[PDB]
Design a protein around this ligand. Structure first.
Ligand SMILES: CCSc1ccccc1NC(=O)C[C@@H](C)N1Cc2ccccc2C1=O
Ligand SMILES: CCSc1ccccc1NC(=O)C[C@@H](C)N1Cc2ccccc2C1=O
Ligand SMILES: CCSc1ccccc1NC(=O)C[C@@H](C)N1Cc2ccccc2C1=O
Ligand SMILES: CCSc1ccccc1NC(=O)C[C@@H](C)N1Cc2ccccc2C1=O
Ligand SMILES: CCSc1ccccc1NC(=O)C[C@@H](C)N1Cc2ccccc2C1=O
Ligand SMILES: CCSc1ccccc1NC(=O)C[C@@H](C)N1Cc2ccccc2C1=O
Lengths: 281, 281, 281, 281, 281, 281
């Protein structure tokens, strides 16, 4: 069944994205720690955020990290489960939201919620989507239940979701930058024994269009090469030599083509005038 | 379940639209206050109205305001509910109308009733819509039950709905004008503490193509900026200063493009000759 | 449930269409008053007529009037009812026809029976329509039950209906003429108090392309203006003054465009040679 | 060859359109009579106007009338001439513009200048159009040459012509109103002998959707009926009796369907906000 | 024939766009004033620039202004000229380029060179365009001939043009900013007599989505209203009163819809990574 | 007219592509220096090669380099020139080939000969292309004239060209490699004064998907920044500092998207089994 537990991954697992870090902090951590400030100005906190961007950029990791910062429970619903509600039996959504309700500080996370529209392609609408919207509107908003939905194809999302009182804050998660890349390497690589002069900074520099998944795959390949060498030795070397990394590098491949990056950037810009508005004074 | 209660929002929450305000007054308040006038001339009052216009213009607020002026109960059915009856279970419409019937002075309000046609795109027809029409025709019309339906896409509405004995009076709700804009700011902003020389009139003047939702977003952004500043101070300032508003303005965005406004104006004109007809005398 | 009662509307409600009035008289009133004459010549009376023409011309009123002249019970089935049995549950047709059969002098009236085809747009065929055809063929024709079907779009009617033993006599009901217009005004206006120099004949002259619905709307607008004036006076004038009319007239709008009228005329002409046939003598 | 002469038709020929009459007066008559006022404010007069509207509404009559009011020479280029220098030999446009240049107070009039695009249906552009544009831009504008272009289908006009320094003022000429209708009857009927109680005001009232061409056809038919009766008498009655008009009316037909009128109205509305702009004071 | 003169319009006429002003200064001024620095570093100056953006933003004005800064001759070729030598006679391109060659400091300006592609809708290619490319490649580049091409539809431009040795620097000219708007008003209005409390800054604030053409139309309308008032008075007031403006404003319309602005912004972004590249040090 | 001169560019201007360098050496050098070996085996040398690959990779530079190593004359025909023969005048091809024939050791180079097919989008055939084929087949092949054709879109080339006795050897020129990149920088940068610790090796490392044109743009931008700084100083620094480069780099963009690279690789693989064929021995 659903796992409702405080994630252990922290912000340091992705060193970059300080802007969205702060934006998330002020969207979940501020309503919860300082409700007395929110009822001062009569502001109603938002209860929905939509992550969009190219695959393998850390959207799930971002949701887990924000849940960890506020020590809020994390409930994760996957795309296959959404498609099984759709193909089936869509009343399970209500009990999912009830499970979230039981734990007041909950970051409900719908992963690839555009899967229904991907599988359906008649307008953008599915019984599961409408029941999710009904449950979301029904949420009192007094609870600390905060919904996050990650998507790779925001262009096909049903516009009904993008409404006030629902997922309204669209956040763009771009490909990792050099500092974020080295942080993503350090995480997911520190577990393995690495020594010699493996300059993770050099790899961060060289890998430019790579995503988190690509760096994960490259570290995976280096570990596998080390394991193969050690096995051949048995049939020592308790660390991953540089040679392993520089051999695994030439099989490194980028998952997202620059055309997709251009499309995501066009979307982000479309969601972007006055510029310098000043009162008469 | 359905909430059947007299709305508290008033006309002052939307300052403008005096023409449609009077038109609504003579469509709901006149049949109820002065039935003795209606049976004098043998006129049968209309029991249906269709609000159409760009999103976020106050159609729901208008329905609630007219219900408040007559002190009639308000029942609100949302688009997700309509779509779940469609995808489901359309016989719930009958009990919804029964609930409305129990309270004689009732403004039944169907929000985004074009949702079924949006999700369906066969011809313009739906089991839920036809059952709604059956219930509409069956209504005695002696009761004070008055139906209002709000739509953003009247072009795709099934023509079955638009007919005498059904939603016949089509009313256009355009974007707020400057006086309406300042009224919408004063409401939805007066709750929060605002001080200094924030000239809401100046904001009303500057925001020209904005809708009610855009002004709501801008006020919420200003409140959030004030909250962030106060929190940073703690980790005083009991009012939203001008700086907050003039910093939130540069993120202000218009939701309805002028192409959609042109389309709505074209529709309204199409629903618009004799000009000067006089008896022979 | 179904209302089975002799209509009270008479022929004078629509003063024109004397030709189709006589044609209906010889199609319903002749078989019933003088069955002995019909069995003399072995002629089998027709048991079906199809009304077609632009909307709001008085087809339902015509059916009620012919039922009233023969004092035959009137059973009216609406388009929403047909569409719900289609979307549902088509066996209700059998019990509807049974109800008609219980009252021997019955004018069964299917209104907008093209509604199913409109909602369906696969060839011209529907479960409810075929069951109606089965029940219509099964009718003994010894009973005085006589079917009438009103349509706005005869071009999409399933040809299965148009055939001997079914709806075969297609009758064209055009827009009202000036005499018919003044009659349609006097009826539905005489109930209200009208005085001064309201020249209903002048209004009939002016309104040329108008239908019954348009004139009804004009009269209702005049009544509403009078009611508004009287209410404002209270917050006298016990009659609708000529000013009220000549004011409401400038909002008068035609419902049927000239293109639709041209299309209906084309259909009627297509349903229309020998010209002068004579025996050799 | 081209006829360059001051037209004899006047404003009284078409009684209505006082608004566009004044507008044309201030576009042609003011730059010519009072250049000393134009050089005061540095205002550069416009040298182009595009008439658009349903056919047979008096656009050519309006051009001739404005030429007559200013006593400016009138040069008329027809649609067939444009299509022949298109299909042919487009350099003759320069000759035409030179002829206009010779007469300084000239109202150059291009009739149905959309004929090229109608015959062409590749983007909206033809060599003759571009040469007309070249000659129009080359015009000094110090001369008094003022271009007018009448169109029935402004939607297909090449956008290049709708530019500043070219045909920029688009004027909408709707169907005649009652006063305009009676004027259009009096003119083009006064020549013939009409007597008895022919009440042209009654005809103006009756004919509502009619254009100038339709009224001209009515008068033509009445004259033809009178001629036929007189000839039959010979093989007296030197006046057109009311019987002739009342018999010719029943053959009266409208040339422009209300769909086209609605399309023209939608275009005009598209070419129609601030509403109440005021200085801070 | 072609007019080859140093333009008189200056930068002050278009107040804003200081960034592109500097960019143009370093594309035309630096090569001409300081060739001794260009041959020092072996850098070959670019001989082509493409202006793109929404219509009526001052692209022609920008070309004239840059020509005026360097006191270089200005040759302007119009779109109709290009389309006529396309429909014709493309060898005249060589004559034009020879005319430019005669004057060494020349800013050759091709206006709406996308006109041929617009009129053509085969692939993107035209004999005139290819001959222009041939003559452009043939240019020695030792001369001071600098080509500028303005376009409203860069998306349909033949890619042949966009290449090193041709129009390579694509420059985006957006809608005027408030400072640019007030500058555009001050120019084009200062010639006329304006007095009272006409606050051009207030108009600049109010007009937000307006272009240069829209402001020019506003000023022209105000001048025309003043002229009409003065002429009526004659049939004094030698200044345009604030009433004239605040009356002309309500007729003000925006020429470029925000959808087109969004498209241009998306193009500019597409033409817009490393971010922080630094040497190892 | 055509320039027939031995190119001065050498192989060192692109340090990579040693494989294709040797392939070209054995296709032009060997037939020319050692005909006595070709007539020994009866081998008939090929007189045609087709360069294909992404734009801006040095195909023209490769043709010039091979012409330089053999000290053969170089004749370059451009795409615009082909398109003007096409749109015009294809008999000029014969005199071009005659000019080539006059110089026996000639490398005739047709640049972007796919330009005609691009402008044409009817099968792949063009009067100019067929005349080129005729002139190419007719050539004795005893002469030393050798034809090279560069194309960016080999997929749309007319297959008639890809025949024995014509352009037959298709050679793929991919994006520059690391050593090729550093060589392309060293050339095209050595002319300018560069000093400090500008580590061209580091730039070669970092720029991975870049083409020759992209590196040229980087170098030009750095030179332009240096020139601007020197001018501002004057209104010293006789070298391009590291700041100039590392600042120009962030504006660097990749001209060829990885999708195009994938398509070119797919084509190359398609033109790419036995694997290990050995005689029975
Ligand atoms: C927002 C990009 S969504 C996307 C991302 C990766 C892979 C594929 C896609 N979608 C598509 O390719 C569909 C095509 C028709 N586009 C293109 C596009 C560009 C910019 C904005 C919106 C659209 C859109 O709907
Ligand atoms: C009444 C505008 S309804 C609308 C509003 C916002 C966003 C989209 C829409 N519909 C459409 O765009 C469909 C297209 C085909 N149009 C255009 C149009 C203009 C004027 C009248 C009716 C139509 C219509 O059916
Ligand atoms: C009999 C007219 S039925 C009609 C009436 C009002 C509104 C719409 C319609 N149908 C249509 O418009 C469909 C189109 C394709 N037509 C045109 C037509 C003209 C004359 C005869 C038959 C047809 C027919 O099938
Ligand atoms: C401006 C109406 S032009 C017109 C007038 C009479 C007869 C025919 C036409 N054109 C058309 O019918 C073409 C169709 C596709 N429409 C319809 C329309 C309505 C409103 C605005 C622009 C358009 C347009 O381009
Ligand atoms: C660069 C916008 S060009 C433009 C400007 C104003 C008016 C019209 C147009 N072109 C179009 O609308 C054609 C359509 C198919 N689009 C859309 C678009 C958006 C962004 C980038 C390229 C394209 C393109 O080719
Ligand atoms: C050889 C790639 S040619 C190319 C290069 C850059 C930019 C565009 C193009 N052509 C195309 O895109 C046309 C499309 C339909 N493809 C795709 C493709 C892939 C692999 C082999 C042949 C084809 C082909 O004909």
């Amino acid at each position: 069944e659903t796992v409702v537990e405080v994630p252990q991954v922290t912000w340091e697992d992705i060193g970059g994205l300080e802007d969205v870090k702060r934006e998330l902090q002020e969207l979940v951590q501020y309503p919860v720690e300082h409700p007395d400030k929110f009822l001062k100005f009569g502001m109603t906190p938002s209860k929905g955020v939509l992550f969009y961007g190219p695959p393998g950029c850390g959207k799930t990791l971002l949701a887990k990290a924000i849940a960890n910062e506020c020590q809020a429970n994390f409930i994760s619903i996957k795309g296959p489960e959404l498609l099984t509600m759709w193909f089936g039996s869509e009343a399970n959504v209500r009990e999912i939201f009830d499970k979230a309700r039981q734990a007041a500080p909950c970051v409900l996370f719908f992963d690839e919620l555009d899967s229904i529209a991907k599988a359906r392609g008649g307008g953008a609408a599915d019984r599961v989507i409408n029941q999710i919207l009904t449950e979301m509107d029904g949420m009192s908003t007094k609870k600390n239940v905060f919904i996050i939905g990650a998507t790779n194809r925001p262009d096909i999302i049903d516009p009904a979701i993008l409404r006030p009182g629902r997922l309204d804050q669209l956040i763009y998660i771009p490909l990792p930058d050099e500092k974020s890349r080295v942080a993503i390497l350090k995480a997911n690589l520190r577990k393995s024994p690495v020594a010699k002069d493996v300059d993770l900074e050099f790899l961060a520099k060289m890998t430019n269009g790579f995503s988190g998944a690509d760096l994960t795959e490259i570290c995976q390949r280096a570990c596998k090469l080390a394991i193969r060498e050690s096995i051949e030795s048995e049939i020592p070397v308790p660390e991953i030599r540089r040679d392993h990394f520089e051999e695994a590098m030439r099989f490194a491949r980028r998952s997202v083509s620059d055309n997709d990056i251009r499309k995501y950037e066009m979307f982000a810009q479309t969601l972007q005038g006055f510029g310098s508005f000043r009162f008469p004074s």
